[PDB]
Design an enzyme around this catalytic site. Structure first.
Site, short mmCIF file in Angstrom:
data_model
loop_
_atom_site.label_atom_id
_atom_site.label_comp_id
_atom_site.label_asym_id
_atom_site.label_seq_id
_atom_site.Cartn_x
_atom_site.Cartn_y
_atom_site.Cartn_z
N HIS B 39 0.85 -1.21 0.00
CA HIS B 39 0.00 0.00 0.00
C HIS B 39 0.87 1.24 0.00
O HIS B 39 0.33 2.33 -0.25
CB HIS B 39 -1.07 -0.05 1.09
CG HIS B 39 -0.64 0.15 2.50
ND1 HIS B 39 0.03 1.27 2.94
CD2 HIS B 39 -0.95 -0.56 3.60
CE1 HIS B 39 0.18 1.22 4.25
NE2 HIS B 39 -0.37 0.06 4.69
N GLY B 137 2.61 6.00 9.97
CA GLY B 137 4.03 5.75 9.65
C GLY B 137 4.61 4.45 10.24
O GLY B 137 5.81 4.13 9.92
N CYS B 139 3.40 1.34 9.60
CA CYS B 139 3.26 0.22 8.65
C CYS B 139 4.63 -0.32 8.30
O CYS B 139 5.54 0.50 8.07
CB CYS B 139 2.49 0.63 7.40
SG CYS B 139 0.78 0.81 7.88
C1 LIG Z 1 0.65 2.48 8.17
O1 LIG Z 1 1.60 3.48 8.49
C2 LIG Z 1 -0.64 2.98 8.73
C3 LIG Z 1 -0.79 2.47 10.17
C4 LIG Z 1 -2.08 2.93 10.80
C5 LIG Z 1 -2.04 4.46 10.96
C6 LIG Z 1 -3.02 4.69 12.14
N1 LIG Z 1 -2.88 3.51 12.96
C7 LIG Z 1 -2.26 2.38 12.16
O2 LIG Z 1 -2.03 1.27 12.59
N2 LIG Z 1 -1.66 2.45 7.88
C8 LIG Z 1 -2.75 3.23 7.35
O3 LIG Z 1 -2.85 4.38 7.60
C9 LIG Z 1 -3.76 2.56 6.42
C10 LIG Z 1 -3.34 2.79 4.96
C11 LIG Z 1 -4.43 2.39 3.94
C12 LIG Z 1 -4.58 0.87 4.01
C13 LIG Z 1 -5.20 0.19 2.77
C14 LIG Z 1 -5.12 0.98 1.47
C15 LIG Z 1 -3.99 1.99 1.42
C16 LIG Z 1 -4.07 2.99 2.56
N3 LIG Z 1 -5.10 2.94 6.70
C17 LIG Z 1 -5.79 2.55 7.92
O4 LIG Z 1 -5.27 1.85 8.70
C18 LIG Z 1 -7.20 3.01 8.19
N4 LIG Z 1 -7.97 1.81 8.36
C19 LIG Z 1 -8.97 1.49 7.36
O5 LIG Z 1 -9.01 2.18 6.39
O6 LIG Z 1 -9.83 0.40 7.59
C20 LIG Z 1 -10.96 0.21 6.75
C21 LIG Z 1 -12.15 1.14 7.13
C22 LIG Z 1 -12.53 2.20 6.30
C23 LIG Z 1 -13.60 3.03 6.65
C24 LIG Z 1 -14.31 2.80 7.84
C25 LIG Z 1 -13.94 1.73 8.66
C26 LIG Z 1 -12.86 0.91 8.31
C27 LIG Z 1 -7.31 3.82 9.49
C28 LIG Z 1 -6.31 4.97 9.46
O7 LIG Z 1 -8.68 4.26 9.63
C29 LIG Z 1 -9.38 4.24 10.85
C30 LIG Z 1 -8.58 4.88 11.99
C31 LIG Z 1 -10.67 5.03 10.64
C32 LIG Z 1 -9.77 2.83 11.24
#
Ligand SMILES: *[C@H](O)[C@H](C[C@@H]1CCNC1=O)NC(=O)[C@H](CC1CCCCC1)NC(=O)[C@@H](NC(=O)OCc1ccccc1)[C@@H](C)OC(C)(C)C
Ligand SMILES: *[C@H](O)[C@H](C[C@@H]1CCNC1=O)NC(=O)[C@H](CC1CCCCC1)NC(=O)[C@@H](NC(=O)OCc1ccccc1)[C@@H](C)OC(C)(C)C
EC number: 3.4.19.12
Lengths: 300, 300
Positions: B39, B137, B139
């Protein structure tokens, strides 16, 4: 998000651990010196002065993995033995020797045979013990904080007391608390809860979305202490209110409002409910620990 | 003596962490390959196939501290990106890629900007999430066990779900649980308590002198499950009774006698009392974790 009992990464301290045999335990190899507990040279009441000037350099063997480091001097400082060796540790980190206060936290790297076995987060308890995990051969294991690229060494392991709690020195060989390195009957007294750390952890809970314990009340510092001291919590001091200021501003919750929430929690209990997945109020995170974990880490 | 949530020493994994920029996150540098979440190349529904064959090697920058590693290939495997680089990591440990089961534990090295920031012990939850501490950050942070001198990599961090819980892959890029690397609404289901681990931790308590919960009763496996499943504990299986055998022999307490003690604890509660300083029954230690901490460490 999420809040965990997090230790510092241990790699900088792992490259300093060696074995010392005279008894076998662990030493800390910094520059051209190995530091270890003086009790390596013993038991009911030794005189270390005698046993020390009585050894030669060949009566200490120091092993850095498979490699024998040659001892070229031996001195004592308080309850720590310093062995001067021929070779400067090429993995010496930038480091300080600090003496911590009760309520402060650090990471322990538990070692056996000069080899790292695990890392966990500890606090210096108000009774100057730590609640660790240490077995036979762990002496010389160290406690530390990292600040920038700088290892701050605060603890060296010397002994277990009854009730499964641990005592040791700073790296100048000075015991924390009123304990001595002799096998006469000692016991730590009754301990106290670290009030400031409990408030820090209630702020961490609010930062992480866990809000159910907040109430609409406020209290004075004196009315708060009147309750807390009944539950064997340290009185909150003005200096503790001051160091909670940053967590207060970040969350919009006044310190004395968080005090009012903690007051209600002590008197009513949790009702089987949990905070950051705990059924007890945790006291082993400082204000700094909260801020490091909730934001400070991203700047690594 | 003493029992703590202990992580593995992290030094072997610290020398593998690098920064990957395409988005910035962490990569794992083993041999001539850097592994990181795919990602990094994105969001509601990407096609990674396209975005990948569309980058050149100069569109990934890999930093190992201050040093730029030159990318000379890019492949995708499941949800993991592999960047082939010109230089073999001189600090590659002996390692395996393993897929763990729900109930198994591991250490997390949380990283930002390719730099280690903290270490803590996690369990794969029955709902295939981990309860971590991760911010923007993080990931590419990894989970691991050490077995002898051998790092077993089991987890790579990809995302946070609602309720502050974490999802990720094995190092072959295969998600734990039914989650996908897209920003569509996903949620983990209701979780379950890891019965076998709770019994392991009750054995650790008895080894460490904490005996007050033992009773004179026994139970059958079926009568035990009849109670435990009412409190949202996984049913205990014969295979779980078998892996508790060593802790049973060491302590002289039959598994089904410990089951009877756990039954009483679930029905009567603790009465405000604690076990190994907890007011909840802990489920994030495996049988192996107990034995390592209570004896296994001395053989390091
Ligand atoms: C990697 O650095 C980060 C780590 C996250 C940052 C906040 N806490 C962590 O553990 N990863 C992300 O930021 C990812 C990146 C995306 C992942 C797939 C596609 C490319 C970008 N995003 C998330 O982790 C979000 N989670 C999520 O989108 O889950 C699906 C979803 C969508 C909508 C409603 C409910 C669930 C996080 C940032 O979102 C929430 C905090 C709202 C869960
Ligand atoms: C260093 O490897 C070990 C670490 C211990 C091993 C068990 N758990 C640990 O943390 N250190 C010791 O084994 C020391 C060594 C002596 C210390 C001073 C003089 C030289 C030898 N011993 C102890 O830690 C004992 N504690 C102790 O003696 O305390 C005083 C005392 C004496 C009599 C009654 C009460 C208190 C331990 C091993 O003893 C008890 C487990 C009984 C507390």
């Amino acid at each position: 998000s999420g809040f965990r009992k997090m230790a510092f990464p241990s790699g900088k301290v792992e490259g300093c651990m060696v074995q010392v045999t005279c008894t076998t335990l662990n030493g800390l190899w910094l520059d051209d010196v190995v530091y270890c507990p003086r009790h390596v040279i013993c038991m009911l009441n030794p005189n270390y002065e005698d046993l020390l000037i009585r050894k030669s350099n060949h009566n200490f063997l120091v092993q850095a993995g498979n490699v024998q480091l040659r001892v070229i001097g031996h001195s004592m400082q308080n309850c720590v033995l310093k062995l001067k060796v021929d070779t400067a540790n090429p993995k010496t980190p930038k480091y300080k020797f600090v003496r911590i206060q009760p309520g402060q936290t650090f990471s322990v790297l538990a070692c056996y045979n000069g080899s790292p076995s695990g890392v966990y987060q500890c606090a210096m308890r108000p009774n100057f013990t730590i609640k660790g995990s240490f077995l036979n051969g762990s002496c010389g294991s160290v406690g530390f904080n990292i600040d920038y690229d700088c290892v701050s060494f605060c603890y060296m392991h010397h002994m277990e007391l009854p009730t499964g709690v641990h005592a040791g020195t700073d790296l100048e060989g000075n015991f924390y608390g009123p304990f001595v390195d002799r096998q006469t009957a000692q016991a730590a007294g009754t301990d106290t809860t670290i009030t400031v750390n409990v408030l820090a952890w209630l702020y961490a809970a609010v930062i992480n979305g866990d809000r159910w314990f907040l109430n609409r009340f406020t209290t004075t510092l004196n009315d708060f202490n009147l309750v807390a001291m009944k539950y064997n919590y340290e009185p909150l001091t003005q200096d503790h209110v001051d160091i909670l200021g940053p967590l207060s501003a970040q969350t919009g919750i006044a310190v004395l409002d968080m005090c009012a929430s903690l007051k209600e929690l002590l008197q009513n209990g949790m009702n089987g409910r949990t905070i950051l997945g705990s059924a007890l109020l945790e006291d082993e995170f400082t204000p700094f620990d909260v801020v490091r974990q909730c934001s400070g880490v991203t700047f690594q």
